[model samples]
Target: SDYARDNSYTKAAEDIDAQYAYSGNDLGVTYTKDATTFKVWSPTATGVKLNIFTKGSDDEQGASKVASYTLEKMLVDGEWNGVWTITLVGEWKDYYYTYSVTTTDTTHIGSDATKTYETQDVYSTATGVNGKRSMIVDLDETDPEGWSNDSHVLLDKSTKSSVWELHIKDFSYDKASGVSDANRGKYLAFTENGTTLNGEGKVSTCIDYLKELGVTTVQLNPFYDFQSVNEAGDDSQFNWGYDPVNYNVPEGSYSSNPYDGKVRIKECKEMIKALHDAGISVVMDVVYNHTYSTDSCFQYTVPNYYYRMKTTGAFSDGSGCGNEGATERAMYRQYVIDSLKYWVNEYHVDGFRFDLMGLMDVETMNMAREALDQIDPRITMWGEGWAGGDSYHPTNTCSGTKFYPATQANASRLSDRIAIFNDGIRDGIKGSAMDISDVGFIQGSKSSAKGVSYGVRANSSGTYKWKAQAPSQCVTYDACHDNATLYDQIIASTGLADYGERNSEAVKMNRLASAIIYTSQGISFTLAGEEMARSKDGDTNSYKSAANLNMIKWQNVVDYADVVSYYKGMMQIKSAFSPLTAMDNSYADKYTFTKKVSASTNQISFTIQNDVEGEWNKMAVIYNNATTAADVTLSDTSVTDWVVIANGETAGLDSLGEVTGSTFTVPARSAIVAVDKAGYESAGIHSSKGKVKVNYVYEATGEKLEDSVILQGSVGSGYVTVPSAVIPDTYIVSRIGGNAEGKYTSDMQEVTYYYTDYIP
Candidate 1:
């Protein structure tokens, strides 16, 4: 025998796969901004460290005959493993070589105890040792020559922001393109015959429609590889382009020529070109969280390594698709990174919406964000932060509702505060049955006897703060391709919103909620007919019958012209007002219902003072959760005109009364907007309109720490909590009676730094 009995050294090389293959890249780790930084993971590494080094070093030769390398960055900051970070040096375009190890664990450890190993390459794929170790890398897709670059960088900064965002299957549609039947939801993939939209002279597509509606940005839901056609006209398939069987190729379900990559790519690019030409940015909805949902084409294309299969003969529900994408490690991680970059470079699409994003961990999220941002920081990217924020955040106020943090749709353990869809805002304004209780919990309605407000639960102070409020780039529409529309929500949750004046009231209330939406913080999104006030007969989950739920009648789009005009007006206003440019929501923080309660009515008003010059400088007193018209009077000399921009999803709705007499009546169940004629003193010169005065505050360096407004003494000060957070110099402390009230443009109070006294 070679050793003690059967210790055959000659067969060690042949029995290489005898040990467990290590993996970590898939578990709990995910990439957002490409692979620049990742959430570190080491189950038992007492002192694990990511020893980042460059290639071409002597370390590789001394180890398992691996590639040479040089150490670069060492991630050793606060909560780094939890929020690990490390950037590449030089003009890497975010490219770097790195490896990792724990003081106790070493890939190079061998039976020869006397042997000492100097170093190893970052990518040392030892035959059966890399167990559950996850890693993330970037691939820029903006490069047209990406295919040639084996290094795989998906996007480069050179491409236009809108051009490099998405990788939609196709975007060629016209009025007659999508049949008005149930397929109306197929607005993105319609090749139907009517819907004749007169574009003056050019053929009309959703892109053109978007341009007219002032929506320079839009996304197409599964526009490619979802179509099924035969000689008998078209018997549509229930498949929504998601059951993809190919990664490098287009789907056969929607594309006219799905098999032809060249054709599909060309057509898809034209759609992008058209959107870009129309000044519209496109975000393709992509599904990378899982492997081929129901197809073998992609599975067969990259076998063994592409997917995380069920060892027990069935698929894993991690993706709810029976199989999950093996995203935790380099192989699948790199595949996703490379594919994204490829689409960015090859197609010139704008951004992306990752489906089933909850399945993706921080590593993937960070890698994607970093990589994409490196290419173009403005590329809009967002996803469901946490399908559930935290289990404890819910209080059984609502059961089986999956009722996690009903208030913090904006909250996430990941400090990446990217834009998020605030179900808090969605429910607060709409107040659906399932979400009614949240109106007060989120808006602090009980405290403010005037009206409701949106914030989060408190820390024993009864002073509710916002764990997650609207961010600049969040998707604000309550409805998306995934769930129900406002109407469906109303029917499903509040069977009350179905009959009589109650329905009318609900419609108006929804309109008010919508007004709150488009005007609040973050980016606002409009579901197709939401503006025109159209709803399904009652199908909350339209992902199934894509036809009935999706079909749109041109007549409806026409009939709801008022709603359309309102939507266009909001977009125009967002453009005219720099405040609407997706900035931090603290802009509206200063306003809330004053304690001045009227014995006669349940009415209240909130004030939102603009921080910027030449912007809308007044508060919008949004009446909340009420069904009766609110007879209110404005005492804040600033408000001169009461204008209702856009109501919740209700249309043809009237905006009653003007702000001329210092008082106006707000319609019941609506968010009434009262502007103090301060923003419009120009060409449209309404000489009669009076002016309102407001003091501006700086968040970075605005206040004095000592008792008497000592500007110099406050110069060296920072937030009370941490020395790093420097305080703004010129902060405006607002007042109702004669005392200081801490509030920002977002109707939020900052860290204890915002004082109740002007001189503290």
Candidate 2:
């Protein structure tokens, strides 16, 4: 812990609790059958008062102060902690409220111009639009029809999740999104069904299209109440929603009715429930690392205690935002955990994607995992594990280099379950996120192949491409909401001036990059429109771009139908196979590289020899980066007979064709894949079928090529037959009435495989 060593700072957590559960949270108003109790935690406050209002609107702070209540200060925690409490009779749920807290504790340093402070409740469940005041509305009143029985989409395991990063407004903000005018650009848009683009109902769009695309998790950008963008205005402004204001409240800007605090919460839950109905989990992109303003309530209530402070009394900028939250502090840590648990328990959120998670200490992340695990083990946790700026705070206790190799995702305890976004693999495969000129693996730049290969192989022990212990600890993607879409990056880095000229090559490279991600061992995440060649008109950073620039055009689905199909197919393939999404790190040992014929050829190939029984014992994938075809010898001693199952052109469960000889040719700028066809079955069905007699025929020609019956079963399932030599030109599986014939097909399944253990 370099930071602690240098500063001699104590890492031990402080006991700031004056009461059992006294916090800015659970303080505003507590509803009961008999009376409504109000509480505020301000240990040093000389006096505290609560003011109630009759009404409020989106454009107003509040209507009028109809009633007021005085709170009596009481000693808590045996006189160390103090709490203020008040009780009011009658139906006060329709009232709006604020606090007047007068405290004499000026122990906190820097910029305290307050003897009496007036602020909204930090734990406000619902707020007046833009969070002008705390609203008292029964949250239960906002529930949709099936709220009580609403359940989260189930995931077999956390590692099996395929995340799709999406922004709420961008999802259906466009005029052409076919969503109702009232629902468009709002949280309720997610509930719209039968959305279509170009050919009307001919093409799928919106949530329907997402299910067709088949991603398990939808990682939504910050939907919490952010600071920027006025909620009273018509929904015209756009944001990536990184700014954090009310941590526990949903964003009002995305709701049809922004004035009522309960409306946003209701519509937000409806959106999540809609996705859950479609078997998709919602992941909130949380920005607890920093708040929108330094003069915010967190600072106003507790002053410097909520933020990391420099030796000179300035604030720490570890999040690149003005002040980073002091997550190491016991109170702040409790706030974060409480806020997250609220989302899961109240909103049915499936997971969280942390922003600048590295700014937080490892202990907090571990505690978060421990906390979420109790609720559901399938609740995924991952984030941007790298800090953006410097924290010159005296404690310097941030998860920075204070923990050396332990900093970021590589740090202790956290590395086990918390996945770090693999920037190393991203830049390695598609060049620098900041620089447009620097090209990477997809653009014929073999310089970063060594690093890219590490990610493709799921950066495990001894690979050392980056510090990830298992595939589960890494999220591999070429682009996200932060940087340029992969489509734009290909144009920028490949010396292409326009998408028109680079359209063909762009699709090729897009498939190439996506192939690497979906086939890799880690959780595969992709931006909203990368599969459909969605671009921001070459804007590398479209974080603040307009709806026209950020929204998925929908036309792209028609224009780049082939590329979209490629992505959908890859997702299906990944879903069907266990080797592709393997959770165990030991499976890395089964990997063996297939050598390239010459030093000049820019091609890579490798085989995965799976020990799991029922499926094909081995699979070899080859990537040809060169413009011209390169010869890849499927010469693995362990893999005797290889038949092409998938390729860059087309792929599925059926055999597309078979390789001719020891030396297999990978098409120019494409990839090909083959599997040992011994058992040709996975553990599930193949094990039950026992064995079958089948014949082969050409799908196109319809000629009964192999009229004889072939014995097919398992090497008990995982065992693949080792061909004595290479098979002839591919033939589709055919014949009927047999055990496997009913489900089996003779359709062509193209194979374009790619894998590498060495760059050279």
Candidate 3:
């Protein structure tokens, strides 16, 4: 009764007329069909309501198209600053909302604020962070000043080359480059104790292995300390560190030395530095919602209020992991904000991959992105686009429920600069709407029944569903460490018999999958060995299998390296054209596809047309998939060449050339890069692809651990201890492999890796 009569406050949202744009995103919002979720943040309120409006301008007068009330609960702990979100039929257009807070003791105004915008009639804003200031900034454009031009201060000009490289990794890229028989991470790292550069002399010794494979960035397994370890694989530390332990601590298992935190820190930095040196950026996987299964209690240790506990001992344990961090609260928000800042500021990390991101609130994520971006605009930030698993617990984790009252999963409503893990790209394209591992499409394919849906439209919004949110802001990839590997997904479709042959058509299909990832829009993150075709042998959730997870044969590169190069060329092309490729919706109309021909029975063919006028401003890489090579003729005569990309190959960007009529002339199984020299005429500066240059792949410098090396390179010294079982004697050299790192950004080291062994 009071909400209708209470017109004392000046309605600020009434006069606000502005639109937001982001550097990394196409201005828009997306949601799953038939699904309408909403999120709100109100800790002090005993009750709240969403005031839906007919015209956005009437939001102040309580007018409405119609108010379908929703509920939202405040968060306890969050890595992102507190900002509430929820689902509704509206997006990027018209919608008015306000809450009715009924506090236990204090009756605060949830919708009507006392002192609102300077112009509002009586002036008003609801109780929340910036309820009055209705404008938000894109993290990409809000770079923190004083940071190096490339964002990493420790790096020099040459090192800057590696900055801004995209790293997609919800799971393993491919233990091999989309073609390995055994497939793991492609390289094995082991030793009798922890010798041979760290362990496993049989694998690579160079951080440039990714570079050697033509990859420009790496999204890593959490380098944080495992929450716990046990004989039972389920509770072991083998999880890519998804079970959060300490937010600041580095993961200990990957290194030769564990107890020494400094050793791990230095070693982790070494890996990052090596990647940077090799012109490859590094992205760290982070989890702030909860801690390890056992001794995990940051909520109580720091400050109990930092986390929201239910008075009835029934808190919102929404995030399935264990607990959800308090995001709406100030203290908890600070914790998450500081955690990410520490990595970006002190550790010099290029970006972060948030695990189960839906657990966080939109305001918090936006604020966190803001703070982190203030440190470095080039620092890539992405996480799971949607919430998964359980919904009820001490702390709410899944955004599935938060969709209506308290927004989670859909951080797309928060900021445009931040990218999301493109679950739809793989799910809709390859799996069922419910699962990415669901191969329901054909008898032997990576996709499900609605498989081609990924290539079609998603919601009434009319946007083609490449992945979560708008296709442009999603960082697309296949399997990662969380669920089943791609290999397992393959098994669910093709069965066990398909693994026997190396050059079989099935192998080519795997190779083609990588091509799909590279040729797609936005950022493409490859699992470690997807290029080499890394397979889990069949172990789906191998998080607990510590040593087993590391059991990959780098020989895939030694055996089928050309396939690796194919993916690399795509990275090079993508990075080179990073600006244009950032958007997946560019060539929707011009992009045409051919029927499935039968030559290889593995490859797929298509064509990307550039019909855009007014200086190109945009461009895209199209894969003309075919079982047999055929002419992928472009309508535009100006088209120079069509680059073919291969999964495993040691060739440069130029090696993978254009199609030759009836035969694309692939190296049995390879990809190519065809640069449209004219494409750059009108491309935006921010739109450059930042292609991962091939030669720069060899320059990484860091502490040596034989497991990471893929292709051999020349380096020197033997400070890294080796074992008689592997190296017997560590080979030393003067430099690492890949291309020569010319200069570097200040925050990052120009050297990709430095060690005591030589691969040559």
Task: Give the candidate number with the greatest lDDT.
Answer: 2
Best by TM-score: 2
Q: What's the count of clashing pairs in each model shown?
A: 122, 33, 165
TM-score, model 2 to reference: 0.85
What is the C-alpha lDDT profile of model 1 across 540-643, one tens digit per residue?
44454645335543344333333444454444444444443434445544544443432123455556666666555654554544555556665555555554
TM-score of each: 0.56, 0.85, 0.55
lDDT of each: 0.38, 0.68, 0.41
Candidate that beats the other on TM-score, 1 or 3, i.e. the better one: 1
Q: Where in model 1 is the C-alpha error above 4 Å?
A: 1-207, 223-235, 292-315, 387-417, 431-452, 455-466, 491-507, 546-549, 580-582, 585-589, 595-604, 633-663, 682-760
Q: Against the true structure, what is every candidate's RMSD?
A: 21.0, 9.6, 18.2
Q: What is the lDDT of candidate 2?
A: 0.68
Error of 2 at 720 (Å): 39
Q: After superposition, how far is residue 542 of candidate 3 from its true place, in Å?
A: 0.5
